[PDB]
Design an enzyme around this catalytic site. Structure first.
Site, short mmCIF file in Angstrom:
data_model
loop_
_atom_site.label_atom_id
_atom_site.label_comp_id
_atom_site.label_asym_id
_atom_site.label_seq_id
_atom_site.Cartn_x
_atom_site.Cartn_y
_atom_site.Cartn_z
N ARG A 63 0.84 -1.19 0.00
CA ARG A 63 0.00 0.00 0.00
C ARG A 63 0.88 1.25 0.00
NH1 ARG A 63 -5.18 -0.06 1.91
NH2 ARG A 63 -4.70 1.77 3.21
N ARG A 111 10.13 4.01 -3.33
CA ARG A 111 10.70 5.03 -4.19
C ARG A 111 12.22 5.13 -4.08
NH1 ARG A 111 6.59 8.56 -5.26
NH2 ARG A 111 4.62 8.25 -4.12
N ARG A 122 -9.53 -5.61 13.46
CA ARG A 122 -8.82 -4.64 14.27
C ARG A 122 -9.64 -3.36 14.39
NH1 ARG A 122 -4.84 -6.08 17.61
NH2 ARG A 122 -3.87 -4.02 17.37
N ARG A 172 0.13 6.80 15.63
CA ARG A 172 0.37 8.06 14.93
C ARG A 172 -0.48 9.19 15.50
NH1 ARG A 172 -2.21 5.47 9.45
NH2 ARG A 172 -4.36 5.27 10.21
N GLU A 211 -3.96 8.05 17.80
CA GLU A 211 -4.62 6.84 17.31
C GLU A 211 -4.07 5.58 17.98
OE1 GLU A 211 -5.12 6.72 13.09
OE2 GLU A 211 -5.01 4.53 13.00
N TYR A 221 -9.70 -5.20 2.64
CA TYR A 221 -9.04 -3.93 2.90
C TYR A 221 -9.39 -2.92 1.81
CZ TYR A 221 -5.34 -1.46 5.50
OH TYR A 221 -4.63 -0.61 6.32
N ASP A 228 -10.27 1.00 0.42
CA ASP A 228 -10.23 2.45 0.56
C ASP A 228 -11.53 3.04 0.03
OD1 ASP A 228 -7.62 2.58 1.66
OD2 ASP A 228 -6.75 2.40 -0.35
C1 LIG Z 1 -9.84 4.03 10.37
C2 LIG Z 1 -10.12 4.09 8.81
C3 LIG Z 1 -9.37 4.94 8.01
C4 LIG Z 1 -9.62 5.00 6.63
N1 LIG Z 1 -8.87 5.85 5.89
C5 LIG Z 1 -9.07 5.93 4.56
C6 LIG Z 1 -8.26 6.86 3.74
O1 LIG Z 1 -7.41 7.55 4.27
N2 LIG Z 1 -8.48 6.95 2.35
C7 LIG Z 1 -9.47 6.14 1.74
O2 LIG Z 1 -9.66 6.21 0.55
N3 LIG Z 1 -10.27 5.23 2.54
C8 LIG Z 1 -10.05 5.14 3.96
N4 LIG Z 1 -10.80 4.29 4.73
C9 LIG Z 1 -11.80 3.49 4.13
C10 LIG Z 1 -13.29 4.05 4.08
O3 LIG Z 1 -13.53 4.83 5.24
C11 LIG Z 1 -14.48 3.09 3.82
O4 LIG Z 1 -14.06 2.03 3.10
C12 LIG Z 1 -15.57 3.75 3.06
O5 LIG Z 1 -16.52 4.50 3.93
C13 LIG Z 1 -16.37 2.83 2.12
O6 LIG Z 1 -17.70 2.42 2.48
P1 LIG Z 1 -17.90 1.15 3.33
O7 LIG Z 1 -19.33 0.76 2.73
O8 LIG Z 1 -16.75 0.06 3.38
O9 LIG Z 1 -18.51 1.76 4.68
P2 LIG Z 1 -17.90 1.35 6.12
O10 LIG Z 1 -17.84 2.74 6.76
O11 LIG Z 1 -16.64 0.40 6.20
O12 LIG Z 1 -19.21 1.01 6.99
C14 LIG Z 1 -20.44 0.95 6.39
C15 LIG Z 1 -21.69 1.17 7.27
O13 LIG Z 1 -22.46 0.01 7.50
C16 LIG Z 1 -23.24 0.35 8.60
N5 LIG Z 1 -23.81 -0.82 9.17
C17 LIG Z 1 -23.15 -1.92 9.58
N6 LIG Z 1 -24.03 -2.80 10.07
C18 LIG Z 1 -25.25 -2.26 9.98
C19 LIG Z 1 -26.52 -2.69 10.33
N7 LIG Z 1 -26.71 -3.93 10.90
N8 LIG Z 1 -27.58 -1.89 10.11
C20 LIG Z 1 -27.41 -0.68 9.55
N9 LIG Z 1 -26.20 -0.23 9.21
C21 LIG Z 1 -25.11 -1.00 9.41
C22 LIG Z 1 -22.25 1.10 9.51
O14 LIG Z 1 -23.01 2.01 10.31
C23 LIG Z 1 -21.37 1.71 8.63
O15 LIG Z 1 -21.62 3.06 8.71
C24 LIG Z 1 -10.57 4.22 6.07
C25 LIG Z 1 -11.32 3.35 6.88
C26 LIG Z 1 -11.09 3.30 8.25
C27 LIG Z 1 -11.87 2.37 9.10
O1 LIG Z 2 5.37 3.59 9.27
C1 LIG Z 2 4.69 2.55 8.79
C2 LIG Z 2 3.53 2.74 8.07
C3 LIG Z 2 2.84 1.63 7.58
N1 LIG Z 2 3.32 0.39 7.83
C4 LIG Z 2 2.61 -0.84 7.32
O2 LIG Z 2 1.86 -0.61 6.20
C5 LIG Z 2 0.52 -1.02 6.48
C6 LIG Z 2 -0.40 -0.06 5.87
O3 LIG Z 2 -0.03 1.27 5.98
P1 LIG Z 2 -1.17 2.38 5.81
O4 LIG Z 2 -0.60 3.79 6.01
O5 LIG Z 2 -1.83 2.23 4.43
O6 LIG Z 2 -2.25 2.01 6.95
P2 LIG Z 2 -3.69 2.56 6.92
O7 LIG Z 2 -4.10 2.77 8.31
O8 LIG Z 2 -4.63 1.66 6.19
O9 LIG Z 2 -3.60 3.89 6.26
C7 LIG Z 2 -4.27 4.97 6.81
O10 LIG Z 2 -3.34 5.87 7.36
C8 LIG Z 2 -2.80 6.95 6.46
C9 LIG Z 2 -2.40 8.10 7.29
O11 LIG Z 2 -1.44 8.96 6.75
C10 LIG Z 2 -3.79 7.44 5.46
O12 LIG Z 2 -4.80 8.13 6.21
C11 LIG Z 2 -4.36 6.33 4.76
F1 LIG Z 2 -4.77 6.60 3.76
F2 LIG Z 2 -3.34 5.48 4.16
C12 LIG Z 2 -5.15 5.56 5.72
F3 LIG Z 2 -6.16 6.50 5.89
F4 LIG Z 2 -5.97 4.58 5.09
C13 LIG Z 2 0.41 -0.94 7.94
O13 LIG Z 2 -0.60 -1.79 8.42
C14 LIG Z 2 1.70 -1.33 8.39
O14 LIG Z 2 1.78 -2.72 8.50
C15 LIG Z 2 4.44 0.26 8.53
O15 LIG Z 2 4.86 -0.86 8.74
N2 LIG Z 2 5.13 1.32 9.01
#
Ligand SMILES: Cc1cc2nc3c(=O)[nH]c(=O)nc-3n(C[C@H](O)[C@H](O)[C@H](O)COP(=O)(O)OP(=O)(O)OC[C@H]3O[C@@H](n4cnc5c(N)ncnc54)[C@H](O)[C@@H]3O)c2cc1C
Ligand SMILES: O=c1ccn([C@@H]2O[C@H](COP(=O)(O)OP(=O)(O)O[C@H]3O[C@H](CO)[C@H](O)C(F)(F)C3(F)F)[C@@H](O)[C@H]2O)c(=O)[nH]1
Ligand SMILES: Cc1cc2nc3c(=O)[nH]c(=O)nc-3n(C[C@H](O)[C@H](O)[C@H](O)COP(=O)(O)OP(=O)(O)OC[C@H]3O[C@@H](n4cnc5c(N)ncnc54)[C@H](O)[C@@H]3O)c2cc1C
Ligand SMILES: O=c1ccn([C@@H]2O[C@H](COP(=O)(O)OP(=O)(O)O[C@H]3O[C@H](CO)[C@H](O)C(F)(F)C3(F)F)[C@@H](O)[C@H]2O)c(=O)[nH]1
Lengths: 391, 391
Positions: B176, B180, B257, B288, B311, B362, B364
């Protein structure tokens, strides 16, 4: 029966802006005279045959401005990429984040500093002089970034670029660089920034493309002004060449700095991994190295070749082309005498003076364009349209 | 007499994309059911009252994609800034350029390395395993960045995020991050990138704004499906909740997780001088720290206050909200059994499974949106419009 409505000396951004505005907005005919075999001045670029990579023949030119009007104006002739210029600094065999910021501070002092811890450290090390009371470059730099950083990143670099004592150099020269207490390493801090999508030459050609604009290359103004001006007696003259050269160095020669370039096509894909690398140490002759493939990361060039350019600074001789004004106390006194003569030439012979060379001023592309627009709006247009006196 | 044409469980980007497409392109009525008191899932954001700074309540969300169709689709509901995400890494009291690049290498090894010298050094230090033959996260990372960098920037960080042996974690997790050999420190390498100009919540509200879309908050699908579905017998169901929870953990519980957050408004203007700072060492509990004022540098907030967020990572308990799938060998075996049950639910009760939680993947934001568009084009639309079987 007048052949031309306006004469323009120089096909740089100032000259072309003037010519374009007069031709398109006033429907007037403009003759542009260029000494060089090409237009655009020092912004002129060419594609390197082996790679196709655009090479800035007269030094790297990065466009940036916060002026919306200028931004909207230049977009009429070219598109811009999302390029954001960043510079790295080489010191004692180590590459540093640049300019003044948390990256530079943390690397140079060996540990991480919070924005507050950084402000403290600098404040301590800037105690000798305060920013407001800085007369020159040296006093300004130390007041901004402290002394230990000044010696390691400014002292040697300034010595190689100007070969002039920093106590005699303008304080405005150092304030061109952003002083930061974050990890942001954008070399510029303007609202708009980018490189011409299809190159600088294409940009400059569009500005002079209008049929009412005639550009004569390989032509020196002083060789042809005796015959041209009688052909168009009422036509004003916008001069963007060297100010002192116009008066044949009557009162003396203004101090200029020129640059020598060393272009090389290496049999490797990547030389330094970044666009511009500054060399602050004196154990190397060149001030910095440009790698033009990193100027356009959105483009894909061959990965077995790369084009680099080393930059050297020295005093501008009589046959050299002036790039930087030195502007010492002696230089400014000489400038004041030429400004008086220039002001007389405007009244006597309708000759305007603009551009970096025409005003002996440190001008960027966006600053010269803005200056050209100001001259058009406030001076040229009222004269050519309503007959208002030029001064 | 059917009240709804489609049921959607979850108001995340997957669910809202599905709902928006069906409602606007097929002129159908969609009921969206959300467990949470707000829409958008984990992309839901809120403005901090003291500063007005947008806070990502469920962790920082940075949007980026190379898919033009997805890019054009999301721009219908929001504008994007020119923000380019960059991450710094804290190790042994020093901030490092991140990720793998010339900046990181030069800092960690004490001197500058040319792109070729860097490739050599890494190649030497990656000799144990080759990239192609990497079974897991540990084998993949070492093959990409070498061992001394692996221990100092991956070992401790991975231990805090997963609490799972890296030999048991997927190799796709480390890929991910861009590998570089330049000074470019953009954390993402996609064509399009930016943050929602008016925030994520405004973006999500626009996607569900259509009058043919009804969103019922604080409503659990399993509590109301017994009454709703008879009201609309032919209406399919798009489920984006936890896959194992749907079948009441019949075959077991998938490993997830979860994350704990620590939001704090400090009486200072700048905490770390950058958006995200990674903490790779084990002498600190959090993985972080986010400083949200740096997410929008084009905005001007008060300089006496700042909002940060620490976090923390741990195993998702039964009452916790699943954020990351672990996907060990045991997890994947359990997933295969749930995929079979899911495939049966589609045939028997017209229930589709999508999203990060619905597929144990996994995903995004841009990947879930793209996945939602694919499900619409290839599965849902042919069914709701032409009567084509769902599988
Ligand atoms: C901590 C974190 C960081 C992330 N950072 C990034 C990022 O930096 N860049 C990026 O592109 N993506 C990121 N993502 C991914 C992104 O947030 C989600 O994948 C995105 O919202 C896609 O939609 P999803 O359907 O997987 O919704 P999700 O938010 O994974 O969840 C979908 C919804 O289902 C609902 N739900 C579940 N069960 C029920 C039920 N029984 N009844 C009614 N509702 C229910 C929940 O309320 C939830 O709101 C991140 C995700 C997390 C968790
Ligand atoms: O310093 C690091 C950073 C990452 N990693 C490994 O890469 C894996 C993935 O790295 P990621 O940055 O993509 O982990 P994610 O939590 O999914 O990424 C979130 O954190 C980032 C914050 O700058 C961005 O918000 C994002 F887009 F990549 C994220 F939101 F999904 C980690 O699980 C870890 O095992 C490391 O091992 N060391
Ligand atoms: C080395 C260097 C690097 C620069 N880098 C940047 C940068 O990164 N970003 C930025 O915004 N700006 C940069 N600039 C500034 C910019 O290149 C110029 O200021 C710009 O072209 C503005 O126009 P100018 O009229 O000052 O033209 P100038 O190019 O300074 O020259 C004008 C023209 O007058 C002509 N001329 C002179 N005498 C005669 C004569 N007797 N007869 C006919 N023609 C004559 C010359 O041929 C010349 O082409 C840089 C300048 C230099 C020298
Ligand atoms: O490492 C440094 C860098 C700069 N300086 C001082 O700042 C003064 C001005 O710095 P600048 O970078 O603005 O010098 P310029 O040559 O005008 O800038 C050109 O070089 C840059 C290259 O990345 C950009 O191309 C540019 F736009 F700023 C430039 F084209 F005009 C120097 O004369 C020197 O005294 C230093 O002292 N040490």
């Amino acid at each position: 029966t007048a052949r031309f409505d306006l004469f323009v000396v120089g096909s740089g951004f100032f000259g072309l802006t003037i010519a374009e505005r007069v031709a398109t907005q006033l429907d007037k005919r403009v003759l542009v005279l260029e000494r060089r075999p090409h237009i655009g001045g020092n912004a002129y670029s060419e594609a390197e045959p082996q790679t196709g990579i655009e090479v800035h023949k007269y030094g790297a030119h990065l466009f940036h401005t916060s002026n919306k009007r200028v931004w909207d104006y230049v977009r009429q002739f070219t598109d811009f990429t999302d390029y954001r210029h960043r510079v790295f600094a080489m010191h004692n065999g180590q590459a540093y984040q640049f300019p003044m910021g948390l990256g530079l501070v943390s690397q140079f002092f060996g540990k991480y500093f919070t924005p507050e811890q950084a402000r403290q450290l600098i404040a301590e090390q800037a105690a000798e002089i305060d920013t407001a009371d800085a007369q020159n470059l040296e006093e300004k730099a130390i007041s901004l970034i402290g002394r230990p950083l000044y010696e390691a990143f400014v002292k040697g670099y300034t010595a190689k670029q100007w070969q002039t004592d920093p106590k005699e150099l303008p304080a405005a020269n150092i304030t061109r660089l952003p002083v930061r207490y974050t990890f942001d390493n954008r070399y510029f801090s303007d609202t708009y920034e980018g490189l011409p999508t299809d190159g600088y030459t294409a940009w400059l050609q569009n500005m002079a493309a209008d049929h009412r604009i005639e550009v004569r290359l390989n032509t020196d103004w002083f060789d042809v002004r005796g015959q041209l001006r009688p052909g168009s007696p009422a036509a004003p003259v916008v001069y963007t060449g060297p100010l002192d050269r116009y008066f044949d160095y009557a009162e003396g020669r203004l101090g200029w700095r020129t640059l020598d370039f060393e272009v090389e096509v290496l049999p490797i894909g990547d030389f330094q991994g970044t666009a511009v690398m500054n060399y602050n140490d004196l154990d190397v002759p060149y001030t910095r190295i440009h790698e033009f493939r990193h100027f356009h990361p959105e483009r894909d060039y061959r990965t077995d070749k790369t084009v680099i350019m080393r930059e050297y600074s020295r005093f501008a001789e009589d046959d050299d082309e002036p790039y930087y004004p030195i502007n010492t106390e002696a230089d400014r006194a000489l400038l004041a005498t030429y400004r008086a003569r220039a002001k007389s030439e405007t009244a006597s012979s309708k000759v305007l003076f603009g551009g970096r060379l025409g005003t002996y001023q440190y001008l960027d592309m966006h600053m010269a364009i803005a200056s050209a627009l100001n001259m058009y709006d406030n001076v040229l247009a009222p004269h050519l349209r309503d007959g208002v006196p030029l001064l």
